[PDB]
């Protein structure tokens, strides 16, 4: 197995998936990992799995459809394995925890968004249908940007955002378009 984190790339106390290399902190792994299990599958080989299972659940998919779907087992564990791909680009410090505005000429956000946040909503099962999750990620980003104007920090925003709606298009086999 790998000797470093895969989400944060430190060493430290790791936990080792059974069924792939990959290794994990126990809060940097989503779900948090679980007590006993053993073997134990990260979430990487569980959504593998799902995918193995219904070769099918990869052809192409309108957003809105997906948007709509209830909060299932299969469509959390999605869920919570785009959230670990945000977490997994550093840049997602900045989007971590609870954020404050102060700054000459800006106003903050009415509804401040934070990925912990999203992270404890999802943990809680607070999200019944998939847009719940989707409209809270994006609303980090939507924030983000209307805060830093024409700072070159709203750059952060952009990148970020990049992230998820790839791994987005991705995990729920979004139908590719131009
Ligand atoms: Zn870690
Ligand atoms: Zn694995
Ligand atoms: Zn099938």
Same mark, same amino acid.
């Given at each position: 197995? /790998?000797?470093?984190?895969? +989400?944060? $790339?430190?060493?430290?106390? *790791?936990?080792?998936? !059974? ?13 948090? =990992? ?25 052809? &192409?998919?309108? #957003?809105?459809? =997906? *948007? %709509?779907?209830? %909060? *299932? ?9 785009? *959230?670990?791909? +945000?977490?997994?680009? /550093? ?5 971590? /925890? ?5 700054? #000459?000429?800006?106003? &903050? ?8 946040? +999203?992270?404890? /909503?999802? $943990?809680?099962? %607070?999200?019944?249908? +998939? #847009?719940?999750? =989707?409209? !809270? %990620? ?12 024409? !700072? ?7 990148? =970020? ?5 790839? $791994?987005?298009? $991705? ?8």
């Amino acid at each position: 197995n /790998s000797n470093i984190c895969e +989400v944060c $790339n430190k060493w430290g106390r *790791l936990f080792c998936c !059974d069924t792939c290399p990959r290794s994990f902190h126990e809060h940097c792994h989503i779900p948090s =990992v679980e007590a006993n299990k053993n073997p134990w599958s990260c979430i990487f080989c569980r959504i593998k799995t799902i995918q193995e299972r219904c070769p099918e659940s990869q052809s &192409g998919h309108q #957003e809105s459809e =997906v *948007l %709509m779907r209830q %909060m *299932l087992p299969e469509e959390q564990l999605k869920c919570e394995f785009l *959230l670990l791909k +945000v977490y997994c680009d /550093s840049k997602s410090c900045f989007f971590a /925890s609870e954020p404050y505005y102060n700054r #000459e000429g800006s106003q &903050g956000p009415q509804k401040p968004m934070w990925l912990n946040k +999203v992270k404890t /909503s999802l $943990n809680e099962q %607070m999200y019944t249908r +998939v #847009e719940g999750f =989707v409209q !809270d %990620m994006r609303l980090i980003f939507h924030n983000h940007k209307e805060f830093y104007r024409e !700072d070159k920090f709203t750059r952060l925003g952009i990148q =970020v955002q990049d992230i998820f709606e790839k $791994n987005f298009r $991705n995990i729920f086999a979004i139908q590719e378009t131009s």
